[PDB]
Design a protein around this ligand. Structure first.
Ligand SMILES: *[C@@H]1O[C@H](CO)[C@@H](O[C@@H]2O[C@H](CO)[C@@H](O[C@@H]3O[C@H](CO[C@H]4O[C@H](CO[C@H]5O[C@H](CO)[C@@H](O)[C@H](O)[C@@H]5O)[C@@H](O)[C@H](O)[C@@H]4O)[C@@H](O)[C@H](O[C@H]4O[C@H](CO)[C@@H](O)[C@H](O)[C@@H]4O[C@H]4O[C@H](CO)[C@@H](O)[C@H](O)[C@@H]4O)[C@@H]3O)[C@H](O)[C@H]2NC(C)=O)[C@H](O)[C@H]1NC(C)=O
Ligand SMILES: *[C@@H]1O[C@H](CO)[C@@H](O[C@@H]2O[C@H](CO)[C@@H](O[C@@H]3O[C@H](CO[C@H]4O[C@H](CO[C@H]5O[C@H](CO)[C@@H](O)[C@H](O)[C@@H]5O)[C@@H](O)[C@H](O)[C@@H]4O)[C@@H](O)[C@H](O[C@H]4O[C@H](CO)[C@@H](O)[C@H](O)[C@@H]4O)[C@@H]3O)[C@H](O)[C@H]2NC(C)=O)[C@H](O)[C@H]1NC(C)=O
Ligand SMILES: *[C@@H]1O[C@H](CO)[C@@H](O[C@@H]2O[C@H](CO)[C@@H](O[C@@H]3O[C@H](CO[C@@H]4O[C@H](CO)[C@@H](O)[C@H](O)[C@@H]4O)[C@@H](O)[C@H](O[C@H]4O[C@H](CO)[C@@H](O)[C@H](O)[C@@H]4O)[C@@H]3O)[C@H](O)[C@H]2NC(C)=O)[C@H](O)[C@H]1NC(C)=O
Lengths: 669, 670
């Protein structure tokens, strides 16, 4: 009941070497051969084993100067740390073949900082062509400390320090149980100990382990600091991809807001206090994460120069808008051209493609970075390697901070400003000659919470003894997560001539906060894409059934590594972990319903699938179409020029079943 | 089924006379009896027909000076207008008998400002002993401009200016119909044209006409400026009525917040911006009301001296709290004494009883007055009779403004700080020997919206012909209003020995915003009294059935004045308008539910009714007990010390049926 895939001899060996690097991540097994290789591995001597002579040499210059020390906390948002990560990445990426790649990782495991290494290695496995189709573990199994509050962490430490339970019945009262040879820890979301404002209503979504894993994967698939030359025709669509990822996410987030009675993400000002604080319960081996109190003055002394930069970055965009056509960064740009999204997105991201370069440079200040830093409310870094981490210093923690959504909402709104320059689609562009959707029905939509466990053993240090006996996997975290029942969408379509067609499904809200029905005019960016697929219509009447379990845009829960070691002994590999790893998890498709049925709408659009003109398959198997991302809702709409027979809006209601509140799953006795 | 009451021809005559002063309020019928008496009436010559000679002369002195001109807006919140209102009230109240009273109203309607007159007259009818049992129209029938936005108002005006509909079918699409000889106007709540913040979710409550008229009723029953000498032993409990009135109302408001997903009423500072604004869509005669933008700085140039006053008022109270026992206002007060609540409430309302005087004075500056003026964001009055009205200048519009609830929550919070000094009740105080509640059961609790019409004719000006011909009642306003289904509360009590008993029923929330069950300790002031009554227990097993419809804390909807004239020809008067006018309306009892059923809980309490030592019937039969208002939840609680077998906590859910959004009742069909 987990989507499998079969696998040969050479594959399993490599995959085992790859997975070796994600276990006991913060320690070293002296007896493991990865260590014997690693200790003595000579990079200079091996120079002929890399595609890029200057990458080896650049790495070597940095490595003698000195890399970040071990145990210190790694973040890519800081110059020196990132530069070392990139130098390391290149070395992984330009290794002639697997053997060389493997050995280089061995050395790097042994000699360099843990976070820096996993960061670079993870990315490398995703980017190397010979590695395509291999599997990596879930971010939460690799970095467990970042996916869980203190309370849990500390129970784990205590149990480990005691080598078990002094009182099993007392431990039980704290949600700690022995299940055969596992220690299982129940975990509440933070609102169960902290309700310091209404945003805490959303913790089952913002603290969700999958959602946060999802953002991490997105970063890794194409990090901002690197070109996208490797992905070919997506290079000319990179900005579009950046807008759409964020647009989709904020729609999804917004949906969660609506169902907990919260409305719009609030606007903010670099020159004013920001309302909602963030009080993180994460610990770092060396420090606590930094808090932002409520009404925090973003314009305090330490931030003056920072705010001057950020304000100018924005103002420079506002200038672009005002002048329509202009030259910036070596490019004549026209805001009338829909292709300009590429520039717009690239600018807001300060990625390598903005400059037409392979890697970004220190003097090219990113807006995202400094915005993250200021809103993170940290004191000034002590030095190049010693900073006070906030949620927004890591891709694995960002979604936890309401301020993150404020920051990307603002960015998305500026891109929407650019999108106002595009002419709206006319009838002719949308009309599907002789095709009409006559009905849509939907099975009941119910959400519900359900326990989920993940391997949390990397959070813990084992003894020399335990590392040798390989007893390194006995810590699991149990947590209630959002889920929903599978559902069919029944679509009835009429057409004169048989034809190849594209079907698209979107989710959007039905009402604003006041209970007025949504116009497309104001609300086209609040539509969330559920699925696209192709069918063949016949003359007459058509019945199209599509199940939620088969929506192209979502993945299944990933499998724990231990379960993957099991499968590799059988020649099996978890399919969704191989090629669908960076999709949103299925269980989070729907926002949490209400007991009464919260009102939403399904938008179904059917259009002709002409041929395979402009065709994305290098980055994402997403857009085998000539069409903008989120077509037909990638620009302003006029309600009356828009609605055509091959469109259907269906009113639907999202229900919720069982326990309403995650914490009711975590009570003892 | 409108609960009736029979009456004699002498009553009928007097009642007609009282009603006449509420028709065509802003105009004068030269042809009517009231005008003939009025024009010519000589007060000085009739000195001997007043109980109090000094009041007649106090009034004559002011009236020679000049009173507020006609047509300006009247508010009791300004010194000079208040003083005129009161000198007038005194004239009404000290009239020897009804004849003199009547003739005096005639004079006052002819010569004085309409608002000032209606104000004084309304209170007079309530306060005068020989008028006890008589009936007054609902405040929305008398001040209809105060219970409606300007959209409806302008349609009413346009129709009147045209003397009909130029296009019935086009009028239909604006929600205007002739029905009989009436023009009927559908009206939405303001959120239908205005969603300037989350607080607009609560419009069907805060704008509700009964809810608003109810506040007006509370004030008229016992205004701050006047003594409560006339209400017997109420005098010793005035501050208690003050607190409880607001505590209850704020609990009820809070429920509406909860069921609309909004949580707690926010705290503010006279030195900081206040976040949520108020954009009123009401009109008066020669101005709109004042707007308060979001983030309005309470501490601007114009408010400096006001805030210094307001700030000192509060801190003086804080000083009381720190001192425990003090001498103030010529009274020795001890905050450990539960009776101190009288002083505490009197202090916050700054009422006549704080000083032991008949009537408050200009030099006794009121807190509520100055807070209202500050948060209303109006500019300085032009002069003693010309101000810019805000919702908070009137009892009939205050509930409309978010700031209103913030202000009274602040006061109520301060009174709650005083209640911290009170010893929590022990087991022995609450335990009813040999008595146990074994089950509580409740029919389905379900709200719905439902069309209600009222007479808005006082909003219009009529011609010479129409006034002469009594064609002066043709404007109706129809509006969806909250209601709920009737329901039964089934209570099974066990007692060894037969005994007379009191049963109380409260409503409370189940959870906070995080969905933790609310504990009694923090939330004993979040409880809303639904009913109290007595039964006779017998040895063994008891079953008490109480319909919501028999809950004594609430009244039925007022009848229009039009149906009262018809009734008075049958010798009948509407009972709930006579004896129960100042109770909360029944149909707003429950907060608007949810389709899935929002969680609350009932608290049911049963205790001994061995005699009737101290009981109130001068104000009205509310507290037939020497028990505090809101007993056993009138002081703070310790969960373990509290739970007793004659209490029962039952979980309930409040549903909503049919349309959830009122505007869906107001769409024209095509
Ligand atoms: C545009 O703006 C301007 C500026 O604001 C507006 O101007 C205002 O207009 C008002 C009229 O609407 C006016 O008020 C009236 O003034 C009358 C005259 O006031 C003087 O005299 C009186 C008393 O008279 C005696 O005085 C001397 C001194 O002893 C003697 O020697 C004389 O012989 C007299 O015996 C003084 O008291 C004043 O100080 C002035 O000097 C007022 O008398 C009149 O008062 C009446 O109205 C009051 C309320 O309506 C009422 O309380 C009072 O008892 C009076 O009642 C009489 O009048 C009513 C109708 O008003 C009538 O039906 C009764 O039968 C009764 O006889 C007014 O108060 C303002 O003075 C003026 N403001 C200024 C600054 O000049 C202007 O209206 C506006 N225009 C438009 C189109 O909007
Ligand atoms: C309490 O607080 C203090 C203050 O912050 C902490 O003190 C710091 O501790 C760290 C140790 O954790 C020290 O770093 C070490 O410094 C050593 C020497 O530093 C200098 O010399 C390096 C070596 O070169 C020398 O060569 C010749 C000798 O023949 C001389 O001519 C010359 O002067 C040089 O000194 C230089 O390269 C360097 O620039 C320094 O100026 C280092 O030997 C040592 O390096 C090792 O460790 C690295 C770990 O990342 C690794 O990269 C290297 O490969 C190498 O093996 C090490 O870094 C800081 O010097 C010290 N700071 C200060 C200001 O004194 C203290 O740790 C803390 N205590 C606790 C308990 O928390
Ligand atoms: C109280 O508040 C409610 C909530 O706003 C008000 O409800 C609105 O009333 C208005 C105007 O009276 C309603 O507008 C009419 O909708 C008609 C039909 O439904 C539409 O179908 C169309 C046409 O294709 C769709 O495109 C729309 O989206 C609608 O669903 C429509 O027939 C009608 O058209 C008329 O006006 C246009 C002007 O451009 C002309 O072209 C045409 O000839 C015709 O005269 C109206 O637009 C509106 O729907 C109601 N609001 C909601 C949310 O439903 C109440 O009116 C208020 N009640 C009072 C007394 O004020």
């Amino acid at each position: 009941t987990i989507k499998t895939k079969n696998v040969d001899a050479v594959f399993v060996e490599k995959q085992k070497k790859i997975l070796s690097f994600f276990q006991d991540v913060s320690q070293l097994n002296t007896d493991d051969e990865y260590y014997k290789i690693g200790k003595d591995y000579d990079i200079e001597m091996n120079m002929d084993n890399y595609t890029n002579k200057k990458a080896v040499e650049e790495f070597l210059k940095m490595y003698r100067t000195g890399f970040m020390p071990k145990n210190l906390e790694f973040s890519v948002f800081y110059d020196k740390m990132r530069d070392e990560a990139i130098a390391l990445f290149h070395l992984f990426y330009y290794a002639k073949d697997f053997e060389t790649f493997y050995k280089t990782a061995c050395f790097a495991r042994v000699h360099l900082n843990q976070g820096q290494f996993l960061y670079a290695f993870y990315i490398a496995v995703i980017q190397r062509s010979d590695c395509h189709g291999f599997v990596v573990p879930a971010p939460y199994e690799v970095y467990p400390k970042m996916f869980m509050n203190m309370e849990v962490l500390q129970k784990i430490y205590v149990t480990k320090m005691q080598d078990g339970l002094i009182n099993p019945e007392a431990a039980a009262k704290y949600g700690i149980h022995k299940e055969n040879d596992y220690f299982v820890y129940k975990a509440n979301y933070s609102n169960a100990v902290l309700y310091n404002n209404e945003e805490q209503r959303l913790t089952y979504f913002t603290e969700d382990i999958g959602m946060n894993a999802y953002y991490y994967y997105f970063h890794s698939h194409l990090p901002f600091w690197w070109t996208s030359e490797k992905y070919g025709a997506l290079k000319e669509r990179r900005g579009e991809v950046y807008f759409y990822f964020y647009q989709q996410l904020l729609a999804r987030y917004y949906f969660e807001r609506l169902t907990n009675g919260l409305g719009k993400i609030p606007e903010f000002s670099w020159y004013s206090p920001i309302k909602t604080g963030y009080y993180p319960l994460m610990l770092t081996k060396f420090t606590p994460f930094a808090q932002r109190p409520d009404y925090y003055n973003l314009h305090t002394e330490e931030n003056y120069e920072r705010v001057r930069f950020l304000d100018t970055y924005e103002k420079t965009f506002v200038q672009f808008l005002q002048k329509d056509h202009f030259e910036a960064f070596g490019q004549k740009i026209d805001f009338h051209d829909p292709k300009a999204i590429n520039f717009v997105g690239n600018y807001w991201q300060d990625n390598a493609d903005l400059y037409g370069e392979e890697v970004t440079k220190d003097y090219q200040r990113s807006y995202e970075v400094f915005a993250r830093r200021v809103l993170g409310a940290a004191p000034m870094p002590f030095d190049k390697y010693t900073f006070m981490p906030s949620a927004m210093d890591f891709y694995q923690t960002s979604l936890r901070d309401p301020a993150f959504y404020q920051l990307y909402n603002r960015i998305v709104e500026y891109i929407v400003e650019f999108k106002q320059y595009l002419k709206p689609y006319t009838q002719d562009k949308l009309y599907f000659d002789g095709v009409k959707i006559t009905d849509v029905k939907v099975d009941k939509l119910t959400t519900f919470f359900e326990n989920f466990e993940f391997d949390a053993s990397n959070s813990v240090y084992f003894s020399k003894e335990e590392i040798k006996n390989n007893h390194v996997h006995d810590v699991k975290v149990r947590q209630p997560r959002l889920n929903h029942s599978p559902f069919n969408v029944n679509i009835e379509v009429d057409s004169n001539v048989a034809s190849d067609a594209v079907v698209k499904i979107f989710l959007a809200p039905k009402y604003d906060d006041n209970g007025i029905p949504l116009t497309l005019e104001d609300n086209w960016m609040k539509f969330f894409e559920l699925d696209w697929f192709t069918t063949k219509l016949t003359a007459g009447q058509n019945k199209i059934i599509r199940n939620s379990n088969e929506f192209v845009i979502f993945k299944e829960d990933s499998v724990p590594m231990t379960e993957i070691m099991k499968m590799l002994d059988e020649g099996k590999v978890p399919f969704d972990m191989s090629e669908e790893f960076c999709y949103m998890p299925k269980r989070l498709m729907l926002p949490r319903g209400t007991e009464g049925g919260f009102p939403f709408q399904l938008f179904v659009f059917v259009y002709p699938f002409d041929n395979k003109g402009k065709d994305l398959a290098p980055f994402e198997s997403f857009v085998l179409d000539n069409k903008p991302l989120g077509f037909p809702l990638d620009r302003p709409v006029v309600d009356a020029l828009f609605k055509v027979p091959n469109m259907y809006f269906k009113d639907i209601f999202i229900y919720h079943e069982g326990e309403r509140f995650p914490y009711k799953f975590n009570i003892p006795s």
